[PDB]
Design an enzyme around this catalytic site. Structure first.
Site, mmCIF file in Angstrom:
data_model
loop_
_atom_site.group_PDB
_atom_site.id
_atom_site.type_symbol
_atom_site.label_atom_id
_atom_site.label_comp_id
_atom_site.label_asym_id
_atom_site.label_seq_id
_atom_site.Cartn_x
_atom_site.Cartn_y
_atom_site.Cartn_z
ATOM 1 N N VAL A 10 0.606 -1.203 -0.283
ATOM 2 C CA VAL A 10 -0.490 0.301 0.416
ATOM 3 C C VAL A 10 0.856 1.486 0.268
ATOM 4 O O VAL A 10 1.593 1.029 0.832
ATOM 5 C CB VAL A 10 -0.916 -0.207 1.224
ATOM 6 C CG1 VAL A 10 -2.107 -1.015 0.764
ATOM 7 C CG2 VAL A 10 -0.058 0.236 2.654
ATOM 8 N N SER A 11 0.114 2.198 -0.127
ATOM 9 C CA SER A 11 1.269 3.613 -0.099
ATOM 10 C C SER A 11 1.714 4.356 0.573
ATOM 11 O O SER A 11 2.698 4.966 1.032
ATOM 12 C CB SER A 11 0.515 4.438 -1.370
ATOM 13 O OG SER A 11 0.834 4.067 -3.168
#
Lengths: 146, 145
Positions: A10-11
Site C-alpha cells: 500500500v502507499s
C-alpha cells in the site's frame, strides 16, 4: 530453488490494515493450494521503482529462483509497465498469479499517484514553481482532494 | 552480438524529428566503430504495445542484443526506464544514451499528460462520467493553449 513468493503493498501507513488484508488473502491462497510461501511487502507508491522489497523480488525473479509471484491485483505490483514486467517474468520462467482481477483499487493512491505525476509533467512543461506550474498543479489538486 | 538503435516520436507530424534521431544514432555508431540496425516507432512512450519496441524487448530476452542506442531515455519508454534497464542488464544488454540532458518535445509532454489524466480519471470516477469529464477537460484546457 523454485520458490513461490507473495507480494503486497500500500502507499501509506494509514492503509496498514489493508496491507495486512492482502497478506492474509495471499497467505490463505497459498495454504489452500498446499504451497510454502515467502511473502514480501512495501509501504510505498506503485510508481516507485526503488521499493526495497519489490527490488528484492525482481532480483530473485531475474536470477531464475522464482516459479510464481502471487498478488491480490495488478497495480499492487506496479502502477505502470505491468505488461512489460509480465513478459520479462515469463522469460525467466515466472508466472504472475492474480487472485482478485477486478478488486477495487484504493482511491487515495489514484489521487496521490495522479498528483505526483501531474507535478512531474508540470515541472517539465513549465518549470518548478512557475506560474503555469502552480496553476495546473493546484487546479488538479482542488478537483481530486474534495 | 548485435547493436540496435531505437528511435521514437509520438505523432506523424514529428517524422522530421524521428529522422534526426536516426542520423544521430547512425553517426554515433559509425564514429565509435559499431555495426548497427535501426528500429523505430511512431507512438507514445506510454504505449507498451508499440510494434518495434515489442520486437526489441523480445530480441533482448533472446540474448541477441549487446547494446541499445537511444537519443535520450524517454525515447525508449516514458515510465519504468530503470526497471527496464535492469531487465536489459540481466540479458547482457547495455543502454547507450546519446544526449542525456536533451529537451524532450513539449507536445509529447502535453499529450502524455492528457493520456495519464484520462486513465486516472476513468479509474477515479468511471469513463465519461461527470467528474471524469470535469477533470480531463480542465486539464486539457490548461495544457493545450
Amino acid at each position: 530453488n523454485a520458490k513461490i513468493i507473495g507480494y503486497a503493498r500500500v502507499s501509506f501507513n494509514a492503509q496498514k490494515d489493508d496491507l495486512e488484508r492482502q497478506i492474509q488473502l495471499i497467505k490463505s491462497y497459498a495454504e489452500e493450494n498446499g504451497w510454502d510461501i515467502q511473502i514480501l511487502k512495501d509501504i510505498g507508491s506503485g510508481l516507485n521503482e526503488k521499493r526495497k522489497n519489490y527490488k528484492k523480488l525482481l532480483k530473485m525473479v531475474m536470477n531464475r529462483k522464482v516459479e510464481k509471484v502471487i498478488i491480490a491485483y495488478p497495480d499492487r505490483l506496479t502502477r505502470f509497465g505491468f505488461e512489460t514486467l509480465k513478459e520479462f517474468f515469463k522469460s525467466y520462467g515466472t508466472e504472475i498469479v492474480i487472485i482478485n482481477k477486478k478488486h477495487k483499487t484504493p482511491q487515495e493512491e489514484l489521487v496521490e499517484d495522479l498528483i505526483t505525476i501531474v507535478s512531474h509533467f508540470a515541472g517539465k512543461l513549465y518549470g518548478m514553481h512557475s506560474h503555469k506550474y502552480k496553476k495546473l498543479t493546484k487546479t488538479v489538486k482542488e478537483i481530486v482532494r474534495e
